[PDB]
Design a protein around this motif. Structure first.
Motif, mmCIF file in Angstrom:
data_model
loop_
_atom_site.group_PDB
_atom_site.id
_atom_site.type_symbol
_atom_site.label_atom_id
_atom_site.label_comp_id
_atom_site.label_asym_id
_atom_site.label_seq_id
_atom_site.Cartn_x
_atom_site.Cartn_y
_atom_site.Cartn_z
ATOM 1 N N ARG A 180 41.569 88.803 76.896
ATOM 2 C CA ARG A 180 42.454 87.877 76.213
ATOM 3 C C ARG A 180 43.692 88.640 75.837
ATOM 4 O O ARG A 180 43.645 89.860 75.674
ATOM 5 C CB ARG A 180 41.810 87.214 74.991
ATOM 6 N N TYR A 181 44.820 87.934 75.730
ATOM 7 C CA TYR A 181 46.053 88.652 75.443
ATOM 8 C C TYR A 181 47.026 87.637 74.834
ATOM 9 O O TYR A 181 46.884 86.418 75.001
ATOM 10 C CB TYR A 181 46.634 89.293 76.723
ATOM 11 N N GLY A 182 48.021 88.136 74.114
ATOM 12 C CA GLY A 182 48.990 87.230 73.527
ATOM 13 C C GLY A 182 49.902 87.948 72.567
ATOM 14 O O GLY A 182 50.200 89.124 72.739
ATOM 15 N N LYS A 183 50.347 87.230 71.539
ATOM 16 C CA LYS A 183 51.325 87.787 70.595
ATOM 17 C C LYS A 183 50.732 87.696 69.196
ATOM 18 O O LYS A 183 50.177 86.660 68.813
ATOM 19 C CB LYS A 183 52.628 86.984 70.636
ATOM 20 N N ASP A 184 50.842 88.795 68.458
ATOM 21 C CA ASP A 184 50.336 88.866 67.085
ATOM 22 C C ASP A 184 51.501 89.066 66.139
ATOM 23 O O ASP A 184 52.598 89.489 66.552
ATOM 24 C CB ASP A 184 49.386 90.069 66.981
ATOM 25 N N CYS A 202 49.155 84.298 65.176
ATOM 26 C CA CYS A 202 48.720 85.041 66.348
ATOM 27 C C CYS A 202 48.165 84.050 67.366
ATOM 28 O O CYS A 202 47.413 83.164 66.996
ATOM 29 C CB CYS A 202 47.662 86.039 65.925
ATOM 30 N N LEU A 210 46.250 84.128 71.171
ATOM 31 C CA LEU A 210 45.684 84.864 72.305
ATOM 32 C C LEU A 210 45.151 83.857 73.305
ATOM 33 O O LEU A 210 44.495 82.892 72.911
ATOM 34 C CB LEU A 210 44.544 85.767 71.842
ATOM 35 N N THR A 223 54.054 87.590 76.779
ATOM 36 C CA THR A 223 53.788 87.441 75.349
ATOM 37 C C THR A 223 55.090 87.019 74.652
ATOM 38 O O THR A 223 55.036 86.281 73.670
ATOM 39 C CB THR A 223 53.185 88.710 74.724
#
Ligand code: AZA
Ligand code: AZA
Ligand code: AZA
Ligand code: AZA
Ligand code: NA
Ligand code: NA
Ligand code: NA
Ligand code: NA
Lengths: 295, 295, 295, 295
Positions: free
Chosen positions: A7-11, A35, A37, A57
């Motif tokens: 999983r990936y994304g912006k925090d 956040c 993800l 992201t």
């Protein structure tokens, strides 16, 4: 080797939104940290350097701002559900979005006994949070919480009758200080999608308020036999007042305040019934958790 | 080489005290973090390994607890003065004591509209502080402060007419968000000793309350031309209301909230009059300070 | 009321700079956090809402980046002096600049026994700092420091022979753990201006290295009679090795590690000569300071 | 209502242990923070105020110290397994123990090119951690990790070919800064009990060292196509070198460093090939995770 999970994304996306009532001149502010993800058919970005499957992201960050511009940001359960649904609907290969929102307090100031139209104070670092998992074909799972609610009672807490063996030095007590930082989470029944979340919108703020009120009243009024016993009473009441909640979880540190024996100094009496000055302990701390659900 | 200055002591001493009213059953709690540093004829501990001049820091810790047991801990200006005076009177070779106290909030809970007798909440990380310097033959100097008071106004702040040169990119504005964490210190006239501090005891809580009220009202009501101009107005009012204060110092970060241009996305309008969603900036921040005294 | 003192500027400006050697391909990175506060004829911004005297804090931020682009950023004593001088020379009504720089560690990685050309690791949160005060007509005052250097020795520390009275419970000891976080500052003789600072450029890195080496060696080798005695030995050596330093100041916490008596459990011996397991104490802590100058 | 899950224990237990070699005079220190949470037949402490089933958290604290006194504390995988096994064997009604250990760095000082016998430095806040779950009848599950390893490379990172749509503003790049804080976890195959953990003792330190070395070398040498692609390469290598590992999980922030366009100022060139000064961004940050297992 194989990718088992990804999983990936912006925090740590900080967002502020203002609402301006043109009629009354009253302004209301909201501030959050978000956040997001994502999961889906993205294994090839890891294994083959195939960036074509990656929603950058940075783009996720832009989407958060755009979504906040075009939608209400309150209650956070609704905003989170809108934001998560966006990603699974917009991108064919994204199949789950995980949205975490922390809401920061900006409480309207009272100036000379009246609510000010555009001035606010941060009254405590208590937070209201949401975790929203939007999974394609499996609906929307929402966990709502409050955290950072720090309380203390100076009496009406006891702790006796625990197991005593060769590892035990703790004295039984019928009167101690009890202090904790409350972390309480209520998990909603699964929602089929955004239409169903919208249908329950009024319940979200009301249930937060109820959870907070039950926590405070129970803490203040219970002649506590242990953290375990008092926390169970809190969870039981919340489940009784909102049928759409499936479970309530509490995680409570026991922040210790130790008596200080001063009798070495001129026979000064500062223990038991005479205890007035105590030493708060930064560490270690008890940690007590419970998840309560329905019969 | 020679010792030019030296001080030593104990920092981060956490102290809690409870007061129990036997008549009414009402309990009141106080919690503080205390630091005490001593100066005097102690150079030989540094230069000759002569420990005979050292009041051990562990003993300083014990003294803080004993002093809290035998004296009121409120207002902190009084407790600090008692504690500092103790060291200079007890030890012939100690000539100055420097006492710093941070007071933590424990606010009585209201349960069902009534004040609870023994339950408290930490409503914000705002602190009330004191710095007390007790110097043999030169009396008692007290600086009182509030810190960690975080506020925001969503309009009625402007910033235009500043210097523009080849280093300037900032646009003038007639409507911006203003947010800060307030650190405000008022310095009392020098007191001759403990008797004089005792004579002014009622002024300490009253002046703290006034400083807080003036800060909040001025922030909320001023159509602010700059942080500089608004903070000066605050300081002027405090000096006018308490003649025993010599100076007021404010130190204010300017915590920026930036507009987000979304016009690249479907012509979305989110700047100037249309600005609704902003990006709070963690860093950098403006930092504006002023010390205001009497003509 | 009157403005007694005022300063304002920008804090927490994070800056990174890379140097690329085209010949060797080797890259070197520098990362800093910078604060610049200005003083001068700016009272009217506070008292009359006259923004014409204000160099906007945003402009100060731009200036920091531009200055880093056009000048070396190392040693930080030089960069700070360039940056401060800029403001007092560029603006007629600005008469002092106060520049604080914190330098973060980026240490070149060794991969397979060889220095890597462009990869770095943050080895500890130890910082190298500078405070530079540039005052029109009074030259340049520089204080250099290291901070956040955390050390521990497990033996060869003693503490006995201190004052014992009715406030004392501490036992004398001939063998204890000593641990601290070192904060050490050396103050340079006043420099007449930038030309003089430039003339001494090689001394800045060398003196930092010497201060660090003396601190570590003295700590490790001294059979310490007290923190006071060991710290004085450190300061004495630094002053002996660099004649352009006027004073050395150390500020040292005494981070306590307590013995744990386990004799209640099966007569287990864990004190004095038998002590193996200890409890590190988060608070309180001793705090010992000294400023050492020349005869 | 019913208790669905419960666990309780002691958190933030700081422990230091020293080993003294009488022959060589060399001392070695270990410092850890430990958390132990228990599960079992304890529901009645919550529902009926039955404290008889509670092993007091204070007793858990004592047990940690006693266990550290009587056993090696290294490698932490072994110490954690000993500590967890103790609780499930000693108490009939306790059926699971969950032990978390954070190991703090105390690295032996080199003084004049030789290892010092009893002086240590904290070189970075990098940690080595263990999570050990001991479940009666189901053996011992161990997850080992390193965390807080902060690295940066100034070139040889790219990011292009990602999805572009109406939410995208990010420019493709063939040369950027890459910086992260590494959190890497390797999960061991289930162990049948303490005898089996003891049999593999040498593998624990060796695998930690390998994980660290692979992480650093891969980061430094990979001409990175994305964080995703580089992290997968790391995980693949670790799994190849230790057959007793079942999965490797990485969680990596992408800590952004932004170019600063200075062209508004005298045409100064500071972008693309001319970029020298950058602005590190505190937030937001990318967050990229992957779990890699065996085919
Ligand atoms: O390495 C990266 N991976 C990503 O997923 C990403 N998104 N924006 N920038 C990025 N860099
Ligand atoms: O080194 C020390 N210096 C002191 O002043 C002190 N006081 N208690 N323990 C101490 N240790
Ligand atoms: O109120 C402000 N004061 C200042 O000095 C400043 N500089 N930039 N923005 C600012 N806002
Ligand atoms: O409320 C408590 N619960 C516990 O489990 C415990 N253990 N020690 N003290 C305690 N207090
Ligand atoms: Na989808
Ligand atoms: Na004296
Ligand atoms: Na000038
Ligand atoms: Na058992």
């Amino acid at each position: 080797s194989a990718v088992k999970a990804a999983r990936y994304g912006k925090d740590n996306v900080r967002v502020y939104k203002v609402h301006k009532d043109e009629k009354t001149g009253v302004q209301t502010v909201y501030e959050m940290t978000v956040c997001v993800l994502l999961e889906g058919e993205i294994e090839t970005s890891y294994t083959k350097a195939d960036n074509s499957v990656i929603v950058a992201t940075d783009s996720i960050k832009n989407t958060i701002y755009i979504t906040a511009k075009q939608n209400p940001v309150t209650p956070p359960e609704l905003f989170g559900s809108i934001l998560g649904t966006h990603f699974i609907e917009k991108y064919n290969h994204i199949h789950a979005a995980h949205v975490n929102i922390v809401c920061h307090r900006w409480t309207r100031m009272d100036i000379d006994g009246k609510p000010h139209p555009h001035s606010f104070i941060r009254d405590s670092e208590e937070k209201r949070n949401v975790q929203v998992d939007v999974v394609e074909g499996k609906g929307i799972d929402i966990k709502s919480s409050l955290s950072g609610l720090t309380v203390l009672k100076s009496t009406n807490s006891q702790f006796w009758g625990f197991l005593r063996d060769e590892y035990t030095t703790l004295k039984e007590t019928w009167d101690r200080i009890l202090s904790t930082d409350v972390d309480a989470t209520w998990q909603w029944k699964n929602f089929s999608g955004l239409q169903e979340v919208r249908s329950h919108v009024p319940k979200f703020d009301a249930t937060w308020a109820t959870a907070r009120e039950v926590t405070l009243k129970t803490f203040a009024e219970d002649n506590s036999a242990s953290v375990q016993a008092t926390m169970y009473k809190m969870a039981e009441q919340i489940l009784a007042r909102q049928q759409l909640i499936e479970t309530v979880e509490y995680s409570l540190p026991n922040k210790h305040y130790f008596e200080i024996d001063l009798s070495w100094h001129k026979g000064l009496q500062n223990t038991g019934k005479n205890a007035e000055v105590f030493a708060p302990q930064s560490d270690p701390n008890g940690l007590i958790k419970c998840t309560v659900g329905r019969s």
